[PDB]
Amino acid sequence: SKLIHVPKEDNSKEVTLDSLLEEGVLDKEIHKAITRMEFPGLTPVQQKTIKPILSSEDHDVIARAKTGTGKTFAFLIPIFQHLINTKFDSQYMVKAVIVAPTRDLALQIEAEVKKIHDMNYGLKKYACVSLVGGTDFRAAMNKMNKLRPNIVIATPGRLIDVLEKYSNKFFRFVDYKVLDEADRLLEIGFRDDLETISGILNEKNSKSADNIKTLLFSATLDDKVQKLANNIMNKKECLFLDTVDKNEPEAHERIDQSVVISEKFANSIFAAVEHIKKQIKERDSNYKAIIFAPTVKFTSFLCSILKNEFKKDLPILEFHGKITQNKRTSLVKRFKKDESGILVCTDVGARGMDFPNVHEVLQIGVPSELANYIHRIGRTARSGKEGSSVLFICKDELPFVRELEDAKNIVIAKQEKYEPSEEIKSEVLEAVTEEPEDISDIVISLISSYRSCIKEYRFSERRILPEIASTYGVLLNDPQLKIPVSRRFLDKLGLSRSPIGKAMFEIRD
RNA sequence: UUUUUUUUUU
Ligand SMILES: Nc1ncnc2c1ncn2[C@@H]1O[C@H](COP(=O)(O)OP(=O)(O)NP(=O)(O)O)[C@@H](O)[C@H]1O
Ligand SMILES: [Mg+2]
Numbered sequence: 331s332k333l334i335h336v337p338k339e340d341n342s343k344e345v346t347l348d349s350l351l352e353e354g355v356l357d358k359e360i361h362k363a364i365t366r367m368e369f370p371g372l373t374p375v376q377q378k379t380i381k382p383i384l385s386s387e388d389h390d391v392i393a394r395a396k397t398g399t400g401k402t403f404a405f406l407i408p409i410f411q412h413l414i415n416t417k418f419d420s421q422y423m424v425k426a427v428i429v430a431p432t433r434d435l436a437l438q439i440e441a442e443v444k445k446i447h448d449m450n451y452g453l454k455k456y457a458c459v460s461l462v463g464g465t466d467f468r469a470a471m472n473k474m475n476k477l478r479p480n481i482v483i484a485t486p487g488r489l490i491d492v493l494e495k496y497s498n499k500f501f502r503f504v505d506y507k508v509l510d511e512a513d514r515l516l517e518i519g520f521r522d523d524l525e526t527i528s529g530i531l532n533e534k535n536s537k538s539a540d541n542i543k544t545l546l547f548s549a550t551l552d553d554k555v556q557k558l559a560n561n562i563m564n565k566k567e568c569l570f571l572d573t574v575d576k577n578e579p580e581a582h583e584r585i586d587q588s589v590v591i592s593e594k595f596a597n598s599i600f601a602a603v604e605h606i607k608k609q610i611k612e613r614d615s616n617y618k619a620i621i622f623a624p625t626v627k628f629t630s631f632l633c634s635i636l637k638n639e640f641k642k643d644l645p646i647l648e649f650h651g652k653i654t655q656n657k658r659t660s661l662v663k664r665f666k667k668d669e670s671g672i673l674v675c676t677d678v679g680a681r682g683m684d685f686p687n688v689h690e691v692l693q694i695g696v697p698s699e700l701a702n703y704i705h706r707i708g709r710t711a712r713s714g715k716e717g718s719s720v721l722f723i724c725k726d727e728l729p730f731v732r733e734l735e736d737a738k739n740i741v742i743a744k745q746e747k748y749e750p751s752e753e754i755k756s757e758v759l760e761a762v763t764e765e766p767e768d769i770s771d772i773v774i775s776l777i778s779s780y781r782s783c784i785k786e787y788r789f790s791e792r793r794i795l796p797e798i799a800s801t802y803g804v805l806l807n808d809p810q811l812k813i814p815v816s817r818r819f820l821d822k823l824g825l826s827r828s829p830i831g832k833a834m835f836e837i838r839d
Numbered sequence: 840u841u842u843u844u845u846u847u848u849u
Contacts, residue, residue, distance in 0.1 A: 487846035
């Protein structure tokens with residue numbers, strides 16, 4: 331299908347809620363809702379996408395816009411307008427399906443729909459239900475039946491689950507599907523699910539298999555997502571609306587980026603602790619920060635250290651996929667409202683989540699994928715605000731920083747070295763209550779995570795894996811101690827004959 | 840000795 335490029339341009343007439351109202355694109359009721367939010371104007375992506383999304387042209391839409399620049403309302407505004415345009419047709423049926431890669435992001439998008447409802451009670455007739463995992467299935471279906479929503483927001487697993495059982499009842503009249511964080515939903519492990527969802531929706535559609543229009547949004551995407559999305563895009567024309575220059579870096583330019591390079595992976599923990607201690611002092615505890623880590627087990631470990639160091643100064647919140655869904659939701663609600671605190675998380679919180687007035691994004695080690703560097707740091711500097719980010723890595727992770735320059739055109743000007751004092755090491759290690767078996771589990775989780783991104787980040791396997799493994803000895807304060815394991819385990823790892831495996835493990839079987 | 844998410848509360 332034909333991809334039509336509409337690139338970023340300089341002096342082009344500003345689009346406003348009024349001008350869209352005056353020109354007949356937006357109805358009074360949706361103009362009213364958004365006006366009462368009292369935004370200075372419409373963001374660039376909103377100005378660019380609202381009219382094309384609503385145009386009677388038979389096209390799909392792809393939109394690129396930097397983190398924190400209002401992509402959510404860029405799709406919700408025209409979705410509401412479509413619901414108004416067709417209000418007497420199939421009024422009890424789902425007309426728009428929005429899919430997100432995480433439950434908390436799905437729930438956030440729903441909360442934003444509810445804000446529109448709150449600014450104009452006349453829009454409540456266009457009801458919304460979220461379909462996400464870790465929530466009661468029956469309670470959610472009771473809500474579908476009671477409210478007969480025109481808008482569904484969902485994560486892929488639970489959406490497929492509902493569709494296999496109830497696609498005929500609610501989903502035969504869908505006109506739009508939206509992939510938020512589209513590039514993420516089209517990677518391995520979501521792409522097949524999105525193809526399944528798209529196939530069901532197209533097959534059940536009462537008008538035709540090509541009826542549904544598809545909208546893709548992300549801060550990180552290009553021409554190549556069209557290829558990846560080929561089986562889910564129905565229309566013969568695809569509009570690519572871009573608010574970023576072709577060669578311009580995708581990272582938000584307002585973020586003051588830096589990297590702190592240690593000799594050892596474990597030293598990044600000490601660097602981060604000292605950085606946080608200094609920020610708490612200098613800002614008189616007026617400090618709101620998010621710190622990312624590579625694995626669930628390590629995030630949990632890092633939370634223990636940060637609580638021991640900083641619980642007296644700031645709240646420390648632990649956010650990952652093994653936290654119960656009730657707690658994930660309640661902690662997201664709190665950190666959205668709070669003026670200060672530290673959110674410690676995995677890449678579950680890398681994309682989409684909008685926590686106002688975060689001062690800094692910190693990262694210990696590398697993201698779960700290259701693009702997530704851009705999304706991670708984009709948790710700060712949202713809707714016009716300032717922000718900073720610090721990447722704490724060790725020397726053997728430097729090829730990641732080179733790949734950021736090579737692949738994404740991101741050059742971090744501020745780079746410095748770090749070496750921990752014996753004082754900080756003692757302070758951090760002595761409060762660690764984890765048993766050796768727990769430290770082993772934690773470091774093994776890191777070995778696995780790093781092993782999986784060696785090719786993508788161009789690491790040297792023979793250097794990076796031993797360095798990650800050596801964290802075990804560092805944390806037990808004995809640097810020639812290796813991780814005790816079984817031969818059966820080493821065989822499973824595929825390192826039984828490797829000198830790399832010999833440098834990491836001791837067969838204490 | 841589940842590497843990040845993502846139905847199984849249908
Ligand atoms: N026109 C506007 N003017 C000012 N703020 C806005 C506007 N539209 C939305 N916002 C706010 O901007 C913040 C970020 O919007 P959001 O839609 O989450 O960004 P996004 O582009 O999806 N970011 P990401 O998902 O991180 O790539 C939210 O707090 C919105 O309320
Ligand atoms: Mg978003």
